Write a protein that binds this ligand. Structure first.
Ligand code: KET
Ligand code: PLP
Ligand code: MG
Lengths: 398, 398
């Protein structure tokens, strides 16, 4: 029956957790996973989630289908979070929004929608990007290309070539952009740079599709969304897929949102029904439990304020692990430039180690990273920071 | 930007919930939606489901990603329920099975797999069927048609027209089949009819896609799986999408499974592999909460054993509303025969009212059904059967 079917590409990450788990080094450190661990190196349960979940368990309720669009409040919660409490665009009702099965599901729905209505659009992703970007858009039959981003020569954005590359693009072509906290690089645009990029997206009539998955891991909630809020202010046909996976420690509960910012209330009505019809032919309606958590935390001002504070705690704990790392490297490689480590943001960092050095960390010291040089800065804490740091020193000098 | 996008007509039944919800009448009844209600007309929370979520809340635990395929346990419960505890097919390792976002997510993943791997196959569904079948398979770019099924003359199957239609189909054409409890009609194939279908499905080399959402609601768990197991014993390449929404009363939590039966271990690994790949590029991995409920109930023998009692309870209550409705009607319109109301199985019945008769039931009585005469029997209970039964006796001598 099925011998024509090829074996899958495979899970690059589980083959990586499997290798680490197997790794015999007692001092082993996993900087390879895409996940927040606290300073005790465990996945945190947030205090506000914990309260929300207590509410859900009292009383245990009947469990109807959620609307295809997800809970009214969940929907609002993504919107306020992304566009600002009581944003003009929200008052005028110019945004169509759905709850979604994570960021992933929001990517999937946006992509499927853009495939149905703009079957002529190619999509570009950044180079590099999270590989699931590509598999999701390719999964819909969109042509995926990449645009020039990480300058491997400098640790910086190759901004010029990037811009000029947008100049070559067609009406309605889609740009998958990271508003903050780049994955895999941690390398972010500046505001004045976002301002440039956006005028280009306006001038060539392109679609910006922003995938924001680390809001608050960056600078702060409001600031992290700058690109989004600018794009709105500029009349761009904005798509926004957003995720609560990392910033609620709710990865498994699959909570996310897709937003589409339209010109007029009537176009909003059109897009919205279509987002609904798309959800319907995929999975029907989103999971209740996750939905209630997002609903409760975002909309209960006290819990929201609590939430935000836990989020900044993580943002800050990362920043310290970041600065604590650079100080040990500069102390011991007197010549070198390590600024990029603290100039980066979010949960990831391109360390600028060569594939070979990354190999040597693993084989000599039990330290797992990805070979493009990506490390998960959250994997680091005080019980492992010296061990990693000195291990990096050994590999870097040689 | 989006002037060219169509209005989405909407999920046809939910706007009808709005119109009944709108209806002013004291004696309003809603028999249109597909939800199981208890003897008090309320959506229940199953006693075993209660226990499970008590466990999930204690302690509230971190929420990591489930594997792409869902919980190994969830996956097992699906498999055991459908093919039988420690079944030959399960021991041999020949069934590739993933947790899914509802049955709907099972149909979707299945459909995509068929689309990626058997791109010339057409899909056939029952005339009529649950609307979403078509919407889903059409949404993956498969061409959907109908096979002759329900007979308006008799309220029976058009069995001859059906096999005859089957005979005209090509190798690897897909048949969407309800193994029991057909939606919308309630009208089921007998065992010998089943063997006969499967025979034709064999001789013409077709693919059976068995979509089973009401296991336990027809006769009992095993009997309801008869076509599935038989096809297995037949060595056909079966796909089985199964849903826990109705029989765990967990609609909102989105818990289903997809199983594909293959000839060799090697084939299982390829196919199963494609399935995780397929999940990855739609939503990454399914919801933890629902997934824990299915895992827990399914594999705790006491809860599992409890759970089944609860289904059979539910099976019984519907069978009683079924017999009660016929008693009232058979007693009061002497000549014509209603055996179909109890010849039918599961949640739905095609009542045979014309749209003229159906409208009038809403217009004069406030009793809400689909225009095609589909009623949901579980919407009935001892407090309104007596009301509804008469509105029908009435609308019928018009
Ligand atoms: C035959 C059938 N198959 C699959 C599904 C998918 O259900 P899920 O909730 O994904 O497990 C349903 C749902 N039927 C409900 C209709 C609906 O979802 O709108 C119903 O009871 O009508 C079916 O009736
Ligand atoms: C982790 C990640 C997501 C995750 O979305 P989920 O589907 O909620 O896990 C989405 N987008 C990006 C860029 C990510 O890094
Ligand atoms: Mg497609």
């Amino acid at each position: 029956m099925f011998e024509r079917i090829d074996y899958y590409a495979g899970d690059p990450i589980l083959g990586l957790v499997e290798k680490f788990a197997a790794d015999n080094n007692p001092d082993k450190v996993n900087l390879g996973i895409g996940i927040y661990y606290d300073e005790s190196g465990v996945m945190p349960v947030l205090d506000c989630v914990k309260i929300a979940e207590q509410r859900i368990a009292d009383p245990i309720s009947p469990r109807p289908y959620l609307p295809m669009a997800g809970l009214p409040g969940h929907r609002k919660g993504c919107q306020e979070l992304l566009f600002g409490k009581d944003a003009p665009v929200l008052k005028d009702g110019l945004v169509a929004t759905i709850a979604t099965i994570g960021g992933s599901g929001a990517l999937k729905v946006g992509a499927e929608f853009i495939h149905e209505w703009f079957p002529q659009s190619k999509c570009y992703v950044s180079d590099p990007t999270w590989g699931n970007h590509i598999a999701i858009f390719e999964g819909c039959d969109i042509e995926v290309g990449k645009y020039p981003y990480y300058d491997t020569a400098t640790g910086g954005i190759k901004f010029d070539e990037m811009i000029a590359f947008f100049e070559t693009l067609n009406k309605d072509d889609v740009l998958l952009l990271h508003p903050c906290c780049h994955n895999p690089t941690g390398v972010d645009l500046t505001r004045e740079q976002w301002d440039t990029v956006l005028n280009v997206i306006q001038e060539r009539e392109l679609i910006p599709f922003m995938d924001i998955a680390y809001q608050g891991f960056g600078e702060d909630m409001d600031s992290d969304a700058y690109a989004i809020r600018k794009a709105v202010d500029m009349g761009l046909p904005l798509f926004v897929s957003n995720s609560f996976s990392k910033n609620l420690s709710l990865y498994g509960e699959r909570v996310g949102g897709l937003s589409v910012v339209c010109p007029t209330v009537d176009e909003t009505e059109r897009v919205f029904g279509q987002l609904n019809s798309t959800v319907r032919r995929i999975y029907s309606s989103p999971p209740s439990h996750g939905g209630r958590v997002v609903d409760i935390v975002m909309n209960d001002a006290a819990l929201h304020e609590q939430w935000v504070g836990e989020v900044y705690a993580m943002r800050d704990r990362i920043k310290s692990m970041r600065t604590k790392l650079k100080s040990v490297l500069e102390a011991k490689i007197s010549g070198r430039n390590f600024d990029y480590l603290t100039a980066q943001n979010g949960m990831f960092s391109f360390t600028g180690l060569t594939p070979e050095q990354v190999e040597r960390l693993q084989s000599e010291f039990g330290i797992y990273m990805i070979s493009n040089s990506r490390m998960c800065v959250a994997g680091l804490n005080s019980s492992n920071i010296d061990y990693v740091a000195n291990a990096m020193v050994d590999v870097l000098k040689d």
